[PDB]
Design an enzyme around this catalytic site. Structure first.
Site, PDB file in Angstrom:
ATOM      1  N   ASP A   1     107.209   5.034  13.884  1.00 33.34           N
ATOM      2  CA  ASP A   1     107.722   3.413  13.132  1.00 33.34           C
ATOM      3  C   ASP A   1     107.348   2.219  13.613  1.00 33.34           C
ATOM      4  OD1 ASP A   1     111.058   3.559  11.840  1.00 33.34           O
ATOM      5  OD2 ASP A   1     109.696   4.045  13.682  1.00 33.34           O
TER       6      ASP A   1
ATOM      7  N   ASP B   1     108.852   1.304  16.289  1.00 33.63           N
ATOM      8  CA  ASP B   1     110.333   0.515  16.832  1.00 33.63           C
ATOM      9  C   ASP B   1     110.907   0.501  18.660  1.00 33.63           C
ATOM     10  OD1 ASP B   1     111.253   2.660  16.479  1.00 33.63           O
ATOM     11  OD2 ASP B   1     112.824   2.130  15.078  1.00 33.63           O
TER      12      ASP B   1
ATOM     13  N   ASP C   1     106.825   5.960  18.970  1.00 31.07           N
ATOM     14  CA  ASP C   1     107.380   7.081  17.914  1.00 31.07           C
ATOM     15  C   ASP C   1     106.370   6.216  16.886  1.00 31.07           C
ATOM     16  OD1 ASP C   1     108.963   4.026  18.000  1.00 31.07           O
ATOM     17  OD2 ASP C   1     110.627   5.589  16.672  1.00 31.07           O
TER      18      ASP C   1
ATOM     19  N   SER D   1     112.276   7.891  11.365  1.00 30.83           N
ATOM     20  CA  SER D   1     112.039   7.544  12.634  1.00 30.83           C
ATOM     21  C   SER D   1     111.017   8.346  14.374  1.00 30.83           C
ATOM     22  CB  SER D   1     113.861   7.192  13.369  1.00 30.83           C
ATOM     23  OG  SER D   1     113.639   6.227  14.409  1.00 30.83           O
TER      24      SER D   1
END
Length: 455
Positions: free
Chosen positions: A243, A245, A241, A97
């Site tokens: 990835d 999302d 960020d 993440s």
């Protein structure tokens, strides 16, 4: 981060805590959980253990009879969107993440495109520990992992299908994109290109070393890109960020805007696009009360909830809400998907901005202005967090204000609010408070700090 699973999956420093051996076991468990012959899509962000980990996962899923598909590198919303609409039985994304560069982890998305519910993390966790694996016979161990080339392309089109492409294309916007040296560079710029913008990207090259800034977009990490935003006079800037999302914006003035400021503006536009839908959005108690103030004058109720994106995605779905969002960027647009989707957000923003014919700087100014003051204070031993809660509660509650204890203690009053919440990672209590008057906020924090300190 629990037994295995943390807040957003299993994670750790790659090749140390998150070792190939662990991921190998976690993979037989995930595979056993989905069942034999289940179609599972595997994808990854840009991080350090990328290839190594995808090979381990694939090897792990075959051992338990899963029909494996490789979707390569992509934003998580993209991979999820793929499992959501491409027919998969679920998927597993190799990502940490927002965590710093040395981290990586395992996210597992269920049949619906959202990460698995907690009761399911437990099933996997049990399987992992009891090692009950649908290990298959040699004679049925005859499958090659297949390739999946529709994830990015499918994702972009899906996103574009929800905004007036021509209207925005007309404004010929000048935007800056900060994908943080990661997977977000494979798609946000593509959506920009469809909406005909002049595109400038900072850190658009893929680099698992994140040399330029930490992957998690914060007022501090965006510090320098906020600069270039200004120096290049862009109409709007967007940072993600690892990835992608998450999406936090930077307006024409070159000032970064927090996830809940833009979540509110976006939460607004969503009602304009769906008068038919239940004016009502979900958000975590970490969000500024400003959201109520602004959405109030539109009849959109804000349903407060625990901190956590996966949970939110489910609550939005479960209550057929208009949208959902977190103060950290990451906004959920149901018509597209229930999960946080940065590109989806960037597109909706360019729409909202296009239809208001106002600059990003001005647009944002249309929101209530609050000053934030935060802090961390250690939890003294022989002091229970439940006692702090009990106190601040019976000292700040009042028929004047309103309290929310669904997660820690949030108090909302006229032009001010605060949240005192126990950390789950550190033996610490986070204290954050903001108000339209910077001083009542600083003061607030001080009082709270005392009480948390057991006075």
């Amino acid at each position: 981060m629990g037994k295995l699973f943390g807040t957003d999956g299993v994670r750790g420093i790659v090749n140390k805590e998150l070792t190939p051996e662990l991921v190998l076991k976690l993979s037989k468990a995930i595979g056993t959980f989905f069942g034999k012959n289940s179609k599972i899509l595997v994808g990854r962000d840009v991080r350090a253990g990328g290839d190594m980990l995808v090979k381990i996962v694939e090897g792990g899923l075959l051992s338990v009879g899963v029909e494996v598909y490789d979707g390569g590198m992509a934003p998580t919303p993209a991979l999820q969107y793929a499992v959501k609409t491409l027919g998969y039985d679920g998927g597993v994304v190799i990502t940490a993440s927002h965590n710093p560069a040395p981290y990586n982890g395992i996210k597992v998305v269920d049949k619906d495109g959202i990460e698995i519910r907690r009761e399911k993390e437990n099933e996997i966790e049990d399987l992992f520990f009891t090692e009950r694996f649908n290990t298959i016979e040699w004679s049925s161990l005859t499958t090659e992992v297949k390739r999946e080339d529709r994830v990015i392309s499918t994702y972009v089109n899906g996103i574009l299908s929800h905004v007036d492409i021509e209207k925005i294309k007309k404004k010929n916007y000048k935007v800056l994109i900060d994908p943080a040296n990661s997977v977000g560079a494979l798609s946000t710029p593509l959506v920009a290109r469809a909406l005909g913008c002049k595109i400038y990207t900072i850190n658009g090259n893929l680099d698992p070393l994140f040399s330029a800034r930490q992957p998690e977009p914060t007022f501090d990490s965006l510090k320098e890109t906020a600069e270039v935003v200004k120096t290049l006079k862009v109409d709007l800037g967007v940072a993600h960020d690892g990835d992608a999302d998450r999406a936090i914006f930077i307006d024409s003035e070159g000032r970064v805007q927090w996830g809940d400021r833009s979540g509110t503006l976006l939460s607004y536009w969503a009602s304009v696009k769906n008068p038919k839908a239940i004016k009502k959005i979900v958000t975590a108690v970490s969000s500024s009360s400003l959201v109520e103030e602004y959405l109030s004058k539109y009849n959109i109720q804000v349903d407060w909830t625990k901190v956590g994106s996966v949970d939110i995605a489910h609550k939005v779905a479960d209550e057929n809400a208009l949208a959902g969002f977190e103060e950290n960027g990451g906004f959920m647009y149901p018509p597209h998907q229930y999960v946080r989707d940065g590109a989806m957000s960037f597109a909706l923003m360019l729409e909202l901005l296009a239809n208001e014919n106002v600059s990003s700087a001005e647009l944002f100014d249309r929101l209530p202005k609050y000053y934030l003051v935060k802090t961390k204070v250690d939890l003294k031993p022989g002091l229970m967090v439940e006692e702090i809660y009990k106190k601040i509660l019976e000292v700040y509650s009042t028929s004047s204000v309103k309290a929310i204890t669904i997660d820690g203690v949030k108090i909302i009053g006229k032009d001010f609010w605060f949240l005192v919440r126990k950390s789950g990672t550190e033996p610490i209590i986070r204290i954050m408070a903001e108000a339209k008057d910077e001083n009542v906020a600083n003061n607030l924090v001080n009082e709270l700090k005392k009480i948390v300190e057991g006075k």
